[PDB]
Amino acid sequence: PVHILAKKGEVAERVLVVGDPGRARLLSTLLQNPKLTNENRGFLVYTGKYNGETVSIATHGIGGPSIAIVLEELAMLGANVFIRYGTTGALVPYINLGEYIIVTGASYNQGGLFYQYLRDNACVASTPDFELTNKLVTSFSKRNLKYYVGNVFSSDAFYAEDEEFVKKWSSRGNIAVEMECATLFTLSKVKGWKSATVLVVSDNLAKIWITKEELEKSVMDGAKAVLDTLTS
Amino acid sequence: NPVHILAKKGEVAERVLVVGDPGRARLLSTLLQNPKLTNENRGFLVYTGKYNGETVSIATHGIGGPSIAIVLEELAMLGANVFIRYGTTGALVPYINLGEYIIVTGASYNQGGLFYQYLRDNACVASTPDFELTNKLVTSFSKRNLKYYVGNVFSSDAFYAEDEEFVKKWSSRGNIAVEMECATLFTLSKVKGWKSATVLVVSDNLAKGGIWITKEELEKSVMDGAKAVLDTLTS
Amino acid sequence: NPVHILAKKGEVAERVLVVGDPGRARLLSTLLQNPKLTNENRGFLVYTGKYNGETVSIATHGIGGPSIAIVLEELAMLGANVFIRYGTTGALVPYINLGEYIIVTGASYNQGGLFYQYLRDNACVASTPDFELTNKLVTSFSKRNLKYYVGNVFSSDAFYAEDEEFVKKWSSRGNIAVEMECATLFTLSKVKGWKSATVLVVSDNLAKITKEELEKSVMDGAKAVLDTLTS
Amino acid sequence: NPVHILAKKGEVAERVLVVGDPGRARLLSTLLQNPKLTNENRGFLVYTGKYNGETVSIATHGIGGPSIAIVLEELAMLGANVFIRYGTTGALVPYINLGEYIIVTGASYNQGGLFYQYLRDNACVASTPDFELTNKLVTSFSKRNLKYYVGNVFSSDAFYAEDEEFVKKWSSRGNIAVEMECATLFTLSKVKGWKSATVLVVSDNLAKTKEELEKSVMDGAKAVLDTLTS
Amino acid sequence: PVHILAKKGEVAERVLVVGDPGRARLLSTLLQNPKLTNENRGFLVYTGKYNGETVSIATHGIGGPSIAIVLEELAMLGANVFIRYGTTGALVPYINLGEYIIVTGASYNQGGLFYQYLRDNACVASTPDFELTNKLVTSFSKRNLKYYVGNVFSSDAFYAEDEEFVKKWSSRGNIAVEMECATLFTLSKVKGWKSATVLVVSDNLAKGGIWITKEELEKSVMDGAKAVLDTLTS
Amino acid sequence: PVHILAKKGEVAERVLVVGDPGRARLLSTLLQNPKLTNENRGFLVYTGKYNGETVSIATHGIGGPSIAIVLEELAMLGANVFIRYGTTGALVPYINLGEYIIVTGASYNQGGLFYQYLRDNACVASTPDFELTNKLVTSFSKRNLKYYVGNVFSSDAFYAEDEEFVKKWSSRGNIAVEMECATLFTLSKVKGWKSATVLVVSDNLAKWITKEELEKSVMDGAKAVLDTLTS
Ligand SMILES: Nc1nc2c(ncn2[C@@H]2O[C@H](CO)[C@@H](O)[C@H]2O)c(=O)[nH]1
Ligand SMILES: Nc1nc2c(ncn2[C@@H]2O[C@H](CO)[C@@H](O)[C@H]2O)c(=O)[nH]1
Ligand SMILES: Nc1nc2c(ncn2[C@@H]2O[C@H](CO)[C@@H](O)[C@H]2O)c(=O)[nH]1
Numbered sequence A: 001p002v003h004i005l006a007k008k009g010e011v012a013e014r015v016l017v018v019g020d021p022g023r024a025r026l027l028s029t030l031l032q033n034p035k036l037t038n039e040n041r042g043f044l045v046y047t048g049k050y051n052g053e054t055v056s057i058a059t060h061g062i063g064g065p066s067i068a069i070v071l072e073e074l075a076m077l078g079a080n081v082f083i084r085y086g087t088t089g090a091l092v093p094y095i096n097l098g099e100y101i102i103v104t105g106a107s108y109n110q111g112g113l114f115y116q117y118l119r120d121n122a123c124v125a126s127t128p129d130f131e132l133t134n135k136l137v138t139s140f141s142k143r144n145l146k147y148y149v150g151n152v153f154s155s156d157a158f159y160a161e162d163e164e165f166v167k168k169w170s171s172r173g174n175i176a177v178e179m180e181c182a183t184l185f186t187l188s189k190v191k192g193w194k195s196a197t198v199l200v201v202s203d204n205l206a207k208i209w210i211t212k213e214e215l216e217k218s219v220m221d222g223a224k225a226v227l228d229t230l231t232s
Numbered sequence B: 001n002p003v004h005i006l007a008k009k010g011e012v013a014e015r016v017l018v019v020g021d022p023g024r025a026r027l028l029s030t031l032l033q034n035p036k037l038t039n040e041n042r043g044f045l046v047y048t049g050k051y052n053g054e055t056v057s058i059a060t061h062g063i064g065g066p067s068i069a070i071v072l073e074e075l076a077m078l079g080a081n082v083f084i085r086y087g088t089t090g091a092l093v094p095y096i097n098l099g100e101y102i103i104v105t106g107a108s109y110n111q112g113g114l115f116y117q118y119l120r121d122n123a124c125v126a127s128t129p130d131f132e133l134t135n136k137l138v139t140s141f142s143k144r145n146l147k148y149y150v151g152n153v154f155s156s157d158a159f160y161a162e163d164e165e166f167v168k169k170w171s172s173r174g175n176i177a178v179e180m181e182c183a184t185l186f187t188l189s190k191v192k193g194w195k196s197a198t199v200l201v202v203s204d205n206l207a208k209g210g211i212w213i214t215k216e217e218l219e220k221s222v223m224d225g226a227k228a229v230l231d232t233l234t235s
Numbered sequence C: 001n002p003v004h005i006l007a008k009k010g011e012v013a014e015r016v017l018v019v020g021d022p023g024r025a026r027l028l029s030t031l032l033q034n035p036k037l038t039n040e041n042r043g044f045l046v047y048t049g050k051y052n053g054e055t056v057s058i059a060t061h062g063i064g065g066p067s068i069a070i071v072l073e074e075l076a077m078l079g080a081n082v083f084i085r086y087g088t089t090g091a092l093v094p095y096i097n098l099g100e101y102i103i104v105t106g107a108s109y110n111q112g113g114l115f116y117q118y119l120r121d122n123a124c125v126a127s128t129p130d131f132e133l134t135n136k137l138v139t140s141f142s143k144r145n146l147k148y149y150v151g152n153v154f155s156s157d158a159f160y161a162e163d164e165e166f167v168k169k170w171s172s173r174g175n176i177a178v179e180m181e182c183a184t185l186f187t188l189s190k191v192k193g194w195k196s197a198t199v200l201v202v203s204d205n206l207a208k209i210t211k212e213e214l215e216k217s218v219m220d221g222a223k224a225v226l227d228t229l230t231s
Numbered sequence D: 001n002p003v004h005i006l007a008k009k010g011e012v013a014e015r016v017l018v019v020g021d022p023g024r025a026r027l028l029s030t031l032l033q034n035p036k037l038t039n040e041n042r043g044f045l046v047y048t049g050k051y052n053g054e055t056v057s058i059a060t061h062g063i064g065g066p067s068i069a070i071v072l073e074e075l076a077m078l079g080a081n082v083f084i085r086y087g088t089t090g091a092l093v094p095y096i097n098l099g100e101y102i103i104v105t106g107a108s109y110n111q112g113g114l115f116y117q118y119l120r121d122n123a124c125v126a127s128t129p130d131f132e133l134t135n136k137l138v139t140s141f142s143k144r145n146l147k148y149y150v151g152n153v154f155s156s157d158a159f160y161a162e163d164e165e166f167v168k169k170w171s172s173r174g175n176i177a178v179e180m181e182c183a184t185l186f187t188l189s190k191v192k193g194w195k196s197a198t199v200l201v202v203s204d205n206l207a208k209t210k211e212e213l214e215k216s217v218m219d220g221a222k223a224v225l226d227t228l229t230s
Numbered sequence E: 001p002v003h004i005l006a007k008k009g010e011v012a013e014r015v016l017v018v019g020d021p022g023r024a025r026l027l028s029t030l031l032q033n034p035k036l037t038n039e040n041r042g043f044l045v046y047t048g049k050y051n052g053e054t055v056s057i058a059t060h061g062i063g064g065p066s067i068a069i070v071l072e073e074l075a076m077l078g079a080n081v082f083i084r085y086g087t088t089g090a091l092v093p094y095i096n097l098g099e100y101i102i103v104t105g106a107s108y109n110q111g112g113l114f115y116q117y118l119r120d121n122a123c124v125a126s127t128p129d130f131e132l133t134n135k136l137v138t139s140f141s142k143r144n145l146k147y148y149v150g151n152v153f154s155s156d157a158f159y160a161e162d163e164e165f166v167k168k169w170s171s172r173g174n175i176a177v178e179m180e181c182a183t184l185f186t187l188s189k190v191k192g193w194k195s196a197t198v199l200v201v202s203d204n205l206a207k208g209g210i211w212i213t214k215e216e217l218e219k220s221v222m223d224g225a226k227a228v229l230d231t232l233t234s
Numbered sequence F: 001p002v003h004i005l006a007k008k009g010e011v012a013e014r015v016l017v018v019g020d021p022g023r024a025r026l027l028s029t030l031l032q033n034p035k036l037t038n039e040n041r042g043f044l045v046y047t048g049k050y051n052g053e054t055v056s057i058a059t060h061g062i063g064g065p066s067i068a069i070v071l072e073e074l075a076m077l078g079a080n081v082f083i084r085y086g087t088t089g090a091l092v093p094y095i096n097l098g099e100y101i102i103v104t105g106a107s108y109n110q111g112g113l114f115y116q117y118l119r120d121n122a123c124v125a126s127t128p129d130f131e132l133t134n135k136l137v138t139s140f141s142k143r144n145l146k147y148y149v150g151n152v153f154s155s156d157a158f159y160a161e162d163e164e165f166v167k168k169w170s171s172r173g174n175i176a177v178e179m180e181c182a183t184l185f186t187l188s189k190v191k192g193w194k195s196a197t198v199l200v201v202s203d204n205l206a207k208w209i210t211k212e213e214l215e216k217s218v219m220d221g222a223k224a225v226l227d228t229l230t231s
């Protein structure tokens, strides 16, 4: 690995991955005896314990290309179970800010990364691990958190998401938009990793405002449910 | 109005078990209370009756995405909105035995044709079944103590273009079996607002040509599984 | 060993008239001498008999390219090598009336899974019928004084996505009708070495007849096709 | 006004025999009665004269789809509506001999720029000749006792990329020869409403005397002219 | 070679390539003791001297498939440096007829020729030789000629270039449209040839209200040819 | 902007963009009175002066999607001139570690990002600003730095770059591989920004360097880039 310079043995088999380095640092305060095992290229990785289990929290940056590199290197250091915890923009009006979306599949446009890894443009089913996803639903229900289960569209161009865009994807059965799930699910299917994803709704493209104190609380509550699942 | 499924108003139930083979539609109809044949046009047999006191239908969809799309579209026009496909499949991994079941979590497919016509472009839309309904099937099958696996399948359009290279390609991509209608079922359902799921009976194993099963043992498997599916549709 | 068409080898003729509707296969079998039902599996009815001093079979192919591909492949494994599809179609031009016929000279299609799986890439391989066989059809229909038009058709994969925008698009591309199996039939036949053709009965005009007038049209056309198959 | 074919309106016939080589256009013009050179701009030689009671033109189209598309479009703007391409080709099957003829029934092609610009998407529109006109060609060649074969051809865009793997791929796809302009001719004609067809002279066999070739080219040209005026 | 029938040593290493054979013959008058080395299939090729340097002027016809054949055969005959000198239609209103465009890259729709040569649909960078292109800039500025530097769209369908077409390509950074540059640049990068292109603006699709006469245009072609030949013999 | 939380006026019109946050911090020491104007999501942005001009040094992360977001937001805050200074893997054996590559174009695989922005799969010419690129060549020559001018392939999958890969792209006129140039150039053409790129060779995929020799290389090239940006 040339991006994540963590020593083997410093990365856990169970990893909670987030796009924002700031979130990784904030969430590391939920672990027992957290240690920073990497900061190279801004990809902060922390390792500690939770519920009698060793767990790491890693930063993946923005986009498929970035998360693909991070996952490949974490896997080379020992990781094989990944739960992405990010933020997303809702594509339907009934979902409120601060609520959660447990992902069951990812839509995506063919090309680049997918062509290079798959060798052709076939539409491979981009889905998370069945069991791990059901465990997430169980954990979020236990903590009485408001969630929705559905597919999301993994976009590669944040600034090309206009109004035509929103009705198009919502009409295709997607309830939110983000940028890394399709890459995570497909690469995991190919590499044999167990992955899942939970997202915090930070905006609604179909429809409200969220402070930041209510948002930080949302992030924190969801993180605890994710860690519960990872260490089950 | 429908031009293939010639049924009248109120004859088609909201919940439907769809199968590809008309022979299987007829055989499974014997599991219902007072089965009535509501359609036979173009060979697409459809039966309507009761199971556990609930009204339900069993419909034939023929082979391939173009065929099942027409049948789903017309059944929906007749009032159907919940579909559980119950078919057969060829396993793509060595550890799955004949007669066992696969509860589908998603479908891989090659772009083009039907999808381009419905989606208007070549984006890879997530082709997945209804989350809740799929979990209900898992519960139902484990209750009847039936051996099943949960995973993705590849929905092929060319039965006779499935060679060895084919098997390693799709199995390496997270698919554990191959059939021909799930991708169309799931995608059209997501776009139309229908609730769908799929359970398949393993009738062959492309990764293990040495194993075989008789129609007696297979028919037995089909029957046991049909009960589990019907329990779910009427839950 | 075929898993859809369970007819015993020798029970399928080298010459086959294929139709999508099982009901039509049953009805047309009455045009053969000493007709025998050689297959019923999966609803794919297949009858074999004689006509004009030759053995001939009438087979059901179902709806769509994936369905007809399977049927053609298995009939061929059983000895068939000449296929003439007889179906129904919706005209894309206003001057063609219901009940008239269309002898197909080529098929337009959208790039898709079936063609990619068989061709291995996205090349637009010419999807055309056998030239000689197609001319024989023209001769047979002309002999029976039947009104027909020759031209290309679009083989759609999605019946319920054919809107008005659809009609202008394909008619401006040189197609005079729409159906769902010709492209698959023609392309597979060229790759496999089979001799194939197609005649269609216009049952609807998307740009502009009693069940008794239609039924007569179907029957009259079937006779022309059988004459061709045994010419 | 057309910017490549500078012929005056009336100087181009409704019936046109099109060839890729300007040298062939010139040579074949001697088969016409009272031939007149109506254009030479950009090297696209066009002659117009008479044959069997009808006015007929012989036009040069250059090499490749982009070139023939431009020539056909401008000839049409000048009054042409029936086109028969007469070219040379390389057989893809060993049983066809040099100097023999191939009457084209369809053209295979790779999806590409020209087709996308004209069709607006990647659909594989049937690239076929006019059925009636093609049958007339068969009749003319048969009457002159010439040896021909009917079949599909692959319209290649890259002459120098046709390796051995190439021969196997296209021959197994139902094509009996390779050339470069038929797909463009057929598809554009179907969209524009023109009546077109093609006859080819086999100048090489990729699977297996110039005095005999000249004879073959001339004999075929007469059969094509008979067809255009039939 | 089966199209360009020249013998060993008759084709120069440096070649000025043009689409119109009429232009090839006309420009040959700028050479010392020009000799016609080929006329087969209409592809006129002349070889002579400029500034005491041996060079050739060759015809390539219209379109990617045509220029590919010509370049491949000229290269088989010994050519390795190509400078295309043709005509083009501007896609922006501020460019006047008779002015010049020095090409920095070519946009194109995938398929056909590119798929056959590249074996897939990757968008390979279609650009000219860096050094040669800068030589042309120096030469044109030296002869005080008005020119613009930018990318062009290499179209395959002349009669499918409507107005929507103009806004689409101009919004993508292309200032003109022609039909051979993408093929020239890509094939050169793959084959190892040194190539570049200068185009004379003969029309403006963004401004249909401007025109030029064959007199003023011929003068434009001539002046530009001198600058190109100066570069080819530098 | 929701990623780069800097106020308009804190981002310069001239920007030197790098992928590594650490490089941005290191290179900021070359500016006069550097100020950190953003750190959100890890995208460090510094703004200071150099040769009488105001300039910013911004972090863009890894990949097309990431740099596209950063460029769009920097532009919304006033930026219109961008010079990417990154690292790259050489695809040809004659280029040594620590040497530089001035980019003249970028090859790429269609799909995703490009389809969303361009609305189709056309291969738009992904090239830098002609003038700005020539200014870079002049600056590197002046500082007697060893450089090569050529095209690069912008890959989206770092871990799919095998041996077959190297020969393929090298045979297509590309002398190095990186991941952001195609996005930078194409988006710049569409948005009307002036962009260019210089890369430090950190690996050679066709054919070693410590780190001190490398840091020296990065530093020397950064000064040449800043000279170009402020000319
Ligand atoms: N494309 C997209 N990504 C979003 C949105 N909201 C949050 N994200 C996530 O946050 C980052 C971009 O802001 C990416 O890592 C995305 O996964 C949104 O509305 N659109
Ligand atoms: N392509 C394919 N379809 C299968 C297989 N086994 C069962 N099927 C199903 O059965 C029919 C074809 O035999 C289709 O309706 C398929 O869904 C198999 O191995 N391959
Ligand atoms: N897509 C389509 N198929 C048609 C039409 N009319 C008849 N068919 C044929 O009939 C069946 C569907 O009704 C298919 O097997 C088609 O070949 C039509 O208007 N559209």
Ligand SMILES: Nc1nc2c(ncn2[C@@H]2O[C@H](CO)[C@@H](O)[C@H]2O)c(=O)[nH]1
Pocket (backbone or CB within 6 Å): D020, D062, D063, D064, D087, D088, D089, D090, D156, D157, D158, D159, D162, D178, D179, D180, D181, D203, D204
């Ligand atoms: N691609 C190709 N074109 C050929 C061949 N033989 C003749 N041609 C024709 O001749 C010209 C190229 O020599 C083009 O106009 C083609 O139509 C061949 O073997 N391959």
Ligand SMILES: Nc1nc2c(ncn2[C@@H]2O[C@H](CO)[C@@H](O)[C@H]2O)c(=O)[nH]1
Pocket (backbone or CB within 6 Å): E019, E061, E062, E063, E086, E087, E088, E089, E090, E155, E156, E157, E158, E161, E177, E178, E179, E180, E202, E203
């Ligand atoms: N497609 C196109 N080619 C042009 C234009 N102006 C000049 N050409 C060139 O001239 C020929 C076609 O007229 C081709 O060789 C082109 O390179 C134009 O506006 N559009």
Ligand SMILES: Nc1nc2c(ncn2[C@@H]2O[C@H](CO)[C@@H](O)[C@H]2O)c(=O)[nH]1
Pocket (backbone or CB within 6 Å): F019, F061, F062, F063, F086, F087, F088, F089, F090, F155, F156, F157, F158, F161, F177, F178, F179, F180, F202, F203
């Ligand atoms: N794909 C790729 N990117 C590289 C390489 N060397 C450096 N990079 C750059 O460094 C990051 C990935 O290591 C991306 O931002 C690339 O632009 C290489 O060999 N391959």
